[PDB]
Every structure is written in structure tokens, then in C-alpha cells.
Amino acid sequence: YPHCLQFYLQPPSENISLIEFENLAIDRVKLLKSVENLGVSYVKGTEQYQSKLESELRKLKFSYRENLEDEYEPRRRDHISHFILRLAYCQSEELRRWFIQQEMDLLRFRFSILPKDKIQDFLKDSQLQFEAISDEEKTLREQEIVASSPSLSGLKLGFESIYKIPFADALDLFRGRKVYLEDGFAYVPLKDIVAIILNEFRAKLSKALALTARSLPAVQSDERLQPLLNHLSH
Amino acid sequence: EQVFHFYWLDAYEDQYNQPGVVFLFGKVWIESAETHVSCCVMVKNIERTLYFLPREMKIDLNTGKETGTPISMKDVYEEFDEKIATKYKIMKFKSKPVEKNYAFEIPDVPEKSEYLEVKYSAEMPQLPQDLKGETFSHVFGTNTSSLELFLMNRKIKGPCWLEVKSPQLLNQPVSWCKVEAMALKPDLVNVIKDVSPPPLVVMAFSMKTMQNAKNHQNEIIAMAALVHHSFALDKAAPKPPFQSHFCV
Amino acid sequence: TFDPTELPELLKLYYRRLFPYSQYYRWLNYGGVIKNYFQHREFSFTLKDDIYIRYQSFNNQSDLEKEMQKMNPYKIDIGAVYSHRPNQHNTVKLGAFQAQEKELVFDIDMTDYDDVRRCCSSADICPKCWTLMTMAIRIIDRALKEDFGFKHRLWVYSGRRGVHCWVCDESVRKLSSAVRSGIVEYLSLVKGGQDVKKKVHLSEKIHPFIRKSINIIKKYFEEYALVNQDILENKESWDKILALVPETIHDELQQSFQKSHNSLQRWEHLKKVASRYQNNIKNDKYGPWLEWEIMLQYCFPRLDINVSKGINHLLKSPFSVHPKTGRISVPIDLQKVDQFDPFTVPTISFICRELDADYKKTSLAPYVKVFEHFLENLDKSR
Amino acid sequence: MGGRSERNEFLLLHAFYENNYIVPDKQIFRKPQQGLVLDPKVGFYDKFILLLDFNSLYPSIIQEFNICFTTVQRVIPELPDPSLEMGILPREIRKLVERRKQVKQLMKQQDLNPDLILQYDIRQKALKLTANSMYGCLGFSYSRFYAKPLAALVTYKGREILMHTKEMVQKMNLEVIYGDTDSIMINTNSTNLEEVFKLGNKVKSEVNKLYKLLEIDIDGVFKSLLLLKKKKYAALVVEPTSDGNYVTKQE
Ligand SMILES: Nc1ncnc2c1ncn2[C@@H]1O[C@H](COP(=O)(O)OP(=O)(O)OP(=O)(O)O)[C@@H](O)[C@H]1O
Numbered sequence A: 001y002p003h004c005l006q007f008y009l010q011p012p013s014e015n016i017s018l019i020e021f022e023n024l025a026i027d028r029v030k031l032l033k034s035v036e037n038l039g040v041s042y043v044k045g046t047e048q049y050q051s052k053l054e055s056e057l058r059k060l061k062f063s064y065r066e067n068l069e070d071e072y073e074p075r076r077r078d079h080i081s082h083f084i085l086r087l088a089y090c091q092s093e094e095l096r097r098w099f100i101q102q103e104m105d106l107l108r109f110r111f112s113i114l115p116k117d118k119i120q121d122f123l124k125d126s127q128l129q130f131e132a133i134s135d136e137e138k139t140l141r142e143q144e145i146v147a148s149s150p151s152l153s154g155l156k157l158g159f160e161s162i163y164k165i166p167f168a169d170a171l172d173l174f175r176g177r178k179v180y181l182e183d184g185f186a187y188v189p190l191k192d193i194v195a196i197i198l199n200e201f202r203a204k205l206s207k208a209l210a211l212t213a214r215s216l217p218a219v220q221s222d223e224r225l226q227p228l229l230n231h232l233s234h
Numbered sequence B: 001e002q003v004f005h006f007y008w009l010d011a012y013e014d015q016y017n018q019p020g021v022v023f024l025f026g027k028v029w030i031e032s033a034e035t036h037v038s039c040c041v042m043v044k045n046i047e048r049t050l051y052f053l054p055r056e057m058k059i060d061l062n063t064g065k066e067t068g069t070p071i072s073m074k075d076v077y078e079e080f081d082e083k084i085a086t087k088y089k090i091m092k093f094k095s096k097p098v099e100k101n102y103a104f105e106i107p108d109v110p111e112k113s114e115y116l117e118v119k120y121s122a123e124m125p126q127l128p129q130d131l132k133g134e135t136f137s138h139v140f141g142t143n144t145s146s147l148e149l150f151l152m153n154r155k156i157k158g159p160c161w162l163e164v165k166s167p168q169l170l171n172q173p174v175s176w177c178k179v180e181a182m183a184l185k186p187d188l189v190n191v192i193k194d195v196s197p198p199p200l201v202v203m204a205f206s207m208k209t210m211q212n213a214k215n216h217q218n219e220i221i222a223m224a225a226l227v228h229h230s231f232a233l234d235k236a237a238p239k240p241p242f243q244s245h246f247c248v
Numbered sequence C: 001t002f003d004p005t006e007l008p009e010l011l012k013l014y015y016r017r018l019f020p021y022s023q024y025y026r027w028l029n030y031g032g033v034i035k036n037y038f039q040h041r042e043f044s045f046t047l048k049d050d051i052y053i054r055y056q057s058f059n060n061q062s063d064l065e066k067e068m069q070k071m072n073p074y075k076i077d078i079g080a081v082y083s084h085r086p087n088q089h090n091t092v093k094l095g096a097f098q099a100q101e102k103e104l105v106f107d108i109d110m111t112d113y114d115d116v117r118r119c120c121s122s123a124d125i126c127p128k129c130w131t132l133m134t135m136a137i138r139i140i141d142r143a144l145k146e147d148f149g150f151k152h153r154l155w156v157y158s159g160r161r162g163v164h165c166w167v168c169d170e171s172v173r174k175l176s177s178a179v180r181s182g183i184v185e186y187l188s189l190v191k192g193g194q195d196v197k198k199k200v201h202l203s204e205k206i207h208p209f210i211r212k213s214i215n216i217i218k219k220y221f222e223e224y225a226l227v228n229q230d231i232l233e234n235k236e237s238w239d240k241i242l243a244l245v246p247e248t249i250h251d252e253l254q255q256s257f258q259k260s261h262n263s264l265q266r267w268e269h270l271k272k273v274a275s276r277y278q279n280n281i282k283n284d285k286y287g288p289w290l291e292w293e294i295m296l297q298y299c300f301p302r303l304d305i306n307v308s309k310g311i312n313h314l315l316k317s318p319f320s321v322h323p324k325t326g327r328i329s330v331p332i333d334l335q336k337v338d339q340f341d342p343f344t345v346p347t348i349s350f351i352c353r354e355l356d357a358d359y360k361k362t363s364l365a366p367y368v369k370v371f372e373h374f375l376e377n378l379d380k381s382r
Numbered sequence D: 001m002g003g004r005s006e007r008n009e010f011l012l013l014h015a016f017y018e019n020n021y022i023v024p025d026k027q028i029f030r031k032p033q034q035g036l037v038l039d040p041k042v043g044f045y046d047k048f049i050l051l052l053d054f055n056s057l058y059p060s061i062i063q064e065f066n067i068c069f070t071t072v073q074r075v076i077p078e079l080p081d082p083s084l085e086m087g088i089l090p091r092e093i094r095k096l097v098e099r100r101k102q103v104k105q106l107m108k109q110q111d112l113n114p115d116l117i118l119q120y121d122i123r124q125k126a127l128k129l130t131a132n133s134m135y136g137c138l139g140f141s142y143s144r145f146y147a148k149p150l151a152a153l154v155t156y157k158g159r160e161i162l163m164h165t166k167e168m169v170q171k172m173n174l175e176v177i178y179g180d181t182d183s184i185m186i187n188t189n190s191t192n193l194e195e196v197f198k199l200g201n202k203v204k205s206e207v208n209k210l211y212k213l214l215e216i217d218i219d220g221v222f223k224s225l226l227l228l229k230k231k232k233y234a235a236l237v238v239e240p241t242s243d244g245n246y247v248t249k250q251e
């Protein structure tokens, strides 16, 4: 667990007690339902929403910035909980869509929490390459970035970091001619970067959920997990 | 030329007593009695058909390694007709080129490759199902029962009036039916559609068995049976369902 | 055009002794670094009477020579590198035979400039109007060279009414259909058909691609538009330009156009009025947005979208004769792109006369030289 | 003598032979010595309960998703691309469905000889039985055409569509008490027979427009039912008589 954000694409292979299994499943279901209700009632960006979700995560001890406690407990809890919920929700298309929506909201929130200085390593730790441009390069190509920039008003190129990414990873972004390209690499701001990140994460999650849905019949045989996983959310 | 047509109902085959012959029973109309009577026709010379799928490139059969030459259809034909023929004692076969499709579970089979179609009389021994060749990849149709061959090749779809041309009358009876007929080749019989099924005879029987007093052996003591000679197969069930019966 | 009664013989001659088999194999094999890459390529042949076959393929250069001489295909096109040999496409499972890789191909036609042409029309071409393609090539080449950084671009004359571009970079050959569609969208600005009178619209901010296209066009606009076509000759000519201009100034423009005498001063006065015509009353912004829209609409390249969208879409091969004109698809030299002349392109009849009167003995030597330079760059990159 | 596998296998053999295929060799060993179930809401229901016969579900799945030996790329498989032309097995399943539909049309038109009406009914029943047993022909170890991946995919899709139907009808303000790929008991909470019939028609119509080739129908109505297990219940079968009146047959 190198990083707090993480992409869930490596199932764990540890052994946990049944009580721990149930507690993790219930805690993560509670977190997801709280995320959904909080997003519905409030707006996804208001400081109130972020503070309330911070409090929920603290009380459910699911994630936190790096420290001694974070290294061991919250990150493993998040991992195994996410995969147990994968088992629970891959049964039906509606459940899959709901899980995807709420997991996307949670990932977006966690990304917003993440301080900028670390994003680089996370992108490196995500196992896909995004490169940040230098201050000299940013100064040199500020005019080009502003000219190619979206309807974003003014020439102000603030402190938002700019990254060098292959045009392939920004298909939906550069296809509209709303970004600057150089030698096949696109220069994008932070908001579009997080959009791309969540889109790719959604694709990965959809594929993983389809695979788990196919694999369910092998694992449904267990009798001490059927009554829990069948109706974990329902 | 004399030809007769009859409504076939069931067919019997045996691979040991009369290999390569399919017996086919049914009802044949007779004008003399202006009715329908039992009949049986035996079809002979139902030739086994096998399909040899050839390898695209010759490989040593001892080890499967490369030989160094491609595989042509004539090459596989020659290889078969010499070595497989001598090995499995076949004196007469009509090998031909054919193009057939395969879309089933057998691994490593081209969908639409070329095949060697070997048609030879069923009297000769059947080849093993796992026969493998130096030139040919593998053979299908090794153990296809003659009844299936007759049904598929003649496009017979369940009980339907069949008309046989050149009916030869066998010297000695082979069945208990009132009429018998002969067919040298399966192709001599064709299928005619625009006819209605004839009524048949239905017998409903019931008997009472009893365990022998001494030691556990069933013993039949009483029999009863109802008969209906002219039973319609398309109209409503006749009422009464019978016109005669016997008990003992 | 070209006489078809003489096409077979000449084509025979052509297909016997003028196609660059060695260089063609080298190109389409791209160094032979991928197994069955040459064997898996799809080739398409359009024979006499427009009957065309698909999923054709070959084993090696000798096999290609044998089959191509045996048939003498009237038109040859290249396809995608499929999972298996296209020739045996029938012997593959339904759905398992799918296109896997193809080069990125762009296609520019002159018919699309019918709405933007006066001298010639349809496939008719004259030196005055051909400049369009030149400019187009320049722009697109720059756009591919700088913005996307594709190094191995082969530009070929379509033969009759346009050009083709092949991009053969190893990464480019693996792009999916969606990425190709996105690239086409990026390299396309003229949106809308004949139904819309104003076919170009620019946002407030000028994209650096758009700015560089404007800079390139400013170099050639005067020669192409203001003298050869006389688009501002009289009312019958400048009415078309006025149509895509706001009516509020039309009268004045008409007056000036009626009081003006040539295209240059009308250009200057239109520039002045645009710099004094308040596009948006809120702000005091003035720009050539009308002028630059006119320039781009009259000059900006237009691309065939469906041709490039498909991974399996086929395109005419280089050095292939055009059935409806007899012209040979010849690589267009970038360094001489301005001096290139489609009319001087030596026809199959002309190269045959030069022959009947090795490729270096004919006028295909320079075109083959450009092609070989492209192949040598490809090999050097390896 | 029994066994739908024989008749359906012969149907497949005829179809393949007429289409010039190499049908798999008859098994040599031979010697045949012979989905998802919703947990039932056991209890007492005094409101009208209706049965939706999920018959011909698997044939409908095959027709919809063009599952065939010539389409699915086995090596769990993946759904065939919709653009691909219809396979063989969907082809004759469709043929059976269309001829059943035409026979039903023939039944609809009146002024027919009662014997001919009985003949049409018999033909329709036979076609329905054959269509139902098609899948059993496809997926069974003892069968000639045993294709494990195809059977697994068909069962998976059937379970998916059944679960979707359950959740949808739940969203319709109803509640489903049982169903396994061949029937669905729906509790209507309605004491009006006509209301129940129209509600059943509406659910059938919406599921049909969601799945084009699925042909659902109403099999029976229970005025009051005590459910305990599969084929374990006590009900008042609602036999509809004329003028909208019904008899509560004790079953
Ligand atoms: N109906 C079509 N079928 C197959 N391919 C087509 C068809 N129409 C166009 N194409 C391809 O798309 C291209 C676009 O049409 P167009 O003929 O104008 O291109 P071009 O080669 O530049 O024209 P020309 O051959 O007259 O110089 C064609 O050259 C041709 O390669």
C-alpha cells in the first residue's frame, strides 16, 4: 500500500477472521451509503460536504494521510473492503452502476484531499505514466497553453500544475481541439487531469466488476457468506 | 417400371448380424384389399462415409516433427489409399475432394478446410476413431451408424411417405410383414410429401405378474388386450377406442 | 481519362515492368520485424468491370509478382494487418478474424472544393487552382510534423483530384479507430456542408494550431486568391464573399466594392472596416474574424472523415495507376511540394513511351527516389 | 421411448447436414445409463397471485444474443458481436418460433373445422415443446452437441435477465415471491381480477419491449396461496368462467 489513493486492481491474498470480514463489509457499505446521501443532499464541492465526509471517514477509519497508523490499518481496511463490496455488488447491473457512481464520488473526494506535492508519485504509483512539466517549460509555453486552453477566461496561468501526457490518454480531451499538443504529448490542467484519471478508473472498475460477476458462481457455494453478501446493500 | 410408396414408421439396424443393411418398416397401401397393410423394405449397400482432414504441412508420424514438404490433396489421397488401405484391409473406396465446414468442440480444426471423402461399403472393417496419419491430420465419420447416414443423406424428416424405385422381391421372407421389398442402394428411394398419413393398428395390453411362491421369480398369469384396427393419426381419437379384445 | 482498350496491354506492360516490387516489399514489411506481418497484410484488387476482391494476400515478393502478373489487377489497394492471413479469411472463425493494425491514412479530394472553386470544377484541374492542395499539404504536414510529431509521412498524389498521406510510425500503426477519429477531428476546422452558407466559425481564442495555419495561409493567400480567381472582380464575384459577411456593413462594402477597382484595395478596406466593425457591441474588440474566416474557409484543408475513421478502410497504393485518368499515384516531394505539378506527372502512356522509345531509365526515377528516401528514413529509425 | 435430447439432436443434425457441416461424431463410449432460484417468501397471501410462465426463456436468449456453435468464440466465453449474421442454432430456433406464430394466427381466424382446430393446437403444442427442449439439447453432458462454454454463457444470461426482471417488477410497486427460469409468482395486492389481468398484461408488455424476443404469458391465478417450498403450497386456483366470474378450485 504505497499510497492512500490507489487504484483497486490487485486483489488481496491474506487471511482474515470472519468477524473482521463482516465488520469491514458493513463499514464500507455504511461509508458508501453516507457518500451517496451526502452528495444528494449537498453539493459535491461545498466545504460543508468535504468536512462532513472527512468526519465520516474519520469515524469509520477508512483513510488518512500517511503515518504509522495509516500504513497498516486504514489502507488494508480500504483494500479488502473494496474487494468484498466488489463481490457483493457484481450481481446486477443496477448494483454495478450504483457502486461505480459512489466509488467515483469517493475517489474524487480523496483526490481533492490529496496534497499537490504528492500527486506526481501517486501517478507514478498508479502504474501509468503522467509527467509534470518544469517551471521553465511552463513559462516558455504559457502562451501556447493559454491559446489552446478551454473557454477558461483570461490569460492567467495560475499555480495549477501542468503535465505532459501522450495524446492517446486524452482522446476525449484533445479530440475537441481544447488542449495544446507538442510531439504527440498533450499539456493539460489539473481539473481535466482528474477527469481523465476518474474515467480510466471507471473503465477498470467496470471490467473488474464484469469479471467478478462471471466468477461469482464458484464463490457463492460458501454458506457462511451467502446471507451476508447476497443482501449486503439490498 | 413398377414402383411403390409406403408410410414408414420405424427402422431397424444392426452392425453385426446384417452390417450395412437398414430394415425399414411401415404401412403400404394395397388396392386388392383396398386398405393399408404391414410392409418392410431392407436397404443394402449403405456405404460408410469418412472425412479425412489433412494437415497443411507434412509432419513425421513417429515424432510429429517437420518433414520439409507441403501437403497437397493428391498427396494425402495417395498416402491413405496405399498405407491405410493395406493396414486396415479395404479393397474398394471412392475417394473424392469435398469442402465441408466444422464449427464444433474438436480442437484445432479449420472452419472451412478441404476434406477427403471416402465412401466405401460397410462390409469392410471400420477404422479406429483415433486413427492418425503421417499426411492427414485426423478422420471424422469413423463410427457414424448407417441409420444416421441413410436419414441425413436421403433428407428423410420423420415418418413420411417414401417411394422406392426398382423394388426387387427377395426370394425368402425376412420379416413377419405381409409385404417385403428390396433396395440395392439408398439413393433408389425418394421422399414424397403431398400425402396424408394412413390409419394404423393400435393394441393396448396389460398383464398381471406374480412373484413365484418358492423364491423371488415373476410369473405371468393373466393377460388382456384391446385392439383398434383403423386408428386415425390426424383426426380425433376414435370413440370407442377399440372394437375387439382378448383375455387369457 | 485513358483509353481502356489499350489499358490491359499497357497495364500488363506497366504491371510487368514498372511497379517497384523490391521497394514495395520493403515498405509494406517495414523491416520484417513482426512475424507474418507481410503475410497478414490485406490487399484489395479492383479488376475489369469494377469487380473487386477483398482479403487478398501473398507469401513473399515472388508470390506477389506471380499473382499480380497473372491477374494484372487494374487497381491495387492496401489494407490492415489482420490476425491471420487475409487470403484464408474464410477458414477463420466468425469474429476471430479482425483487423489488428493499419497505417494512419488521410485523403484529400478536390471535389470538396467545388463550393470554393471558380476556374475548374469536379476533377478538372489547372495550375491556378492546384495551389489549394499545396497549401493544404503544407498545413497538414506541419500539423502532423509539429503538433503530433509523426516522423514517417509519405505524401502521394491521388492521381486525378487530390492527394493521400500515409503515416507509418510504429506507434501510429497501433492507434484504434477512436484515436483516429480524434486525430481527424483535431486536424479539421471547416465544419458544415453546402446547407450552411457560413462553413467556418472561430472561437474567441485562437488555437495555436489555428494561429499557425493562419500564419501559413497568410503567405500564399494573395497569390492564390487575389489574382488567379479574381474573387472580387465584380458584383457577380464579390457577392459570394459578401454573403458570409454581416449585412450591417454589406451596403458600405458594396459601395466600396462598387467604388473599388481591384482585389487588393478591397482587401485593405475590408480589413479596415472589420477593425472598425464592432463584432460584439459589449466590447470594443475588432479582428479579422471575418477576414480570417474568409481566408480559412477559402483555403483551409478538408478531409474525408469516413476514409480515415475505419481501421480496415482501404486506400490506393503508391505507384498505382488511376483507372479513370491513367495517372500513377506518385509520392509528392515535400521539399518541392510548391513546384510539384500534377500535369507534368508522367502518365502510364508517357512513361511507356519513354520506355518504348530499370526504373532509373524512366521519369519514375525521382518519384522512386522520394519513395526510397522515405523507406531509408524508416530503416534508419530502426 | 422418451428423451428430448434424441429429437432435438436429430433436428440439429438435419439442420447442419442441409447446411453442409461436419457434425460431431456420435460419442463412442455412449452407454447412457439413464440457473438461479429466488428464495421463496414462504407465507400466506390472501391477495391475488399470478404466475408468469418463463417458458422458452433460453430459446429467447439464444435468439436475442445469436448464441451458436458458428458464432461464439470458445477456447467463460464472450457475447457475440451483434453485427454478426445470425448463426445456425438461432436460425432454426427462429424458424420454429415463426411457424408457431403462423399456426397461432391460423388458430386466431375463426370458421375452421373443429378437427382442424385441434390439429392446429397439437402442432402449436409440439412446436412449443421442441423450442423449450432446444437448450436441453445444447447443454447436457450425454448429448452429442455438449458445448460447456455455450451452456454456461446461456445460463449466465438467463440468470441476469431474470434478476433484472425481478428488480424491475419490484420497482413497479409489486413483489415477487418465487421464480426459477420457468415461472414467476407475483403478488398483486389486488382483490380485483380484471385489475390483476391488466397489471399482468402491462408487466408482460414492458418486459417484452425491454427484451424483444422474450414471449412471456400468464399461466394461472391464485386467489389465496400458502407457500412453503417449491411445489409445496395450498392455493385456490382461480379458474376464470364467463362474464368475468371465476371458480376457486381447491388445489
Ligand atoms: N465508393 C467508394 N468505394 C471505395 N472507396 C472509395 C469510394 N469513394 C472514395 N473512396 C476512396 O476515398 C477516396 C475519396 O474519394 P476521391 O476519389 O475524391 O479521392 P482521390 O483519390 O483524391 O480522387 P482522385 O482519384 O480523382 O484523384 C477515393 O480516392 C478513394 O480512394
Ligand SMILES: [Mn+2]
Binding pocket: C107, C108, C109, C158, C162, C163, C164
Ligand atoms: Mn482519394
Ligand SMILES: [Mn+2]
Binding pocket: C109, C304
Ligand atoms: Mn471518396
Ligand SMILES: [Zn+2]
Binding pocket: C119, C120, C124, C125, C126, C127, C128, C129, C130
Ligand atoms: Zn483550375
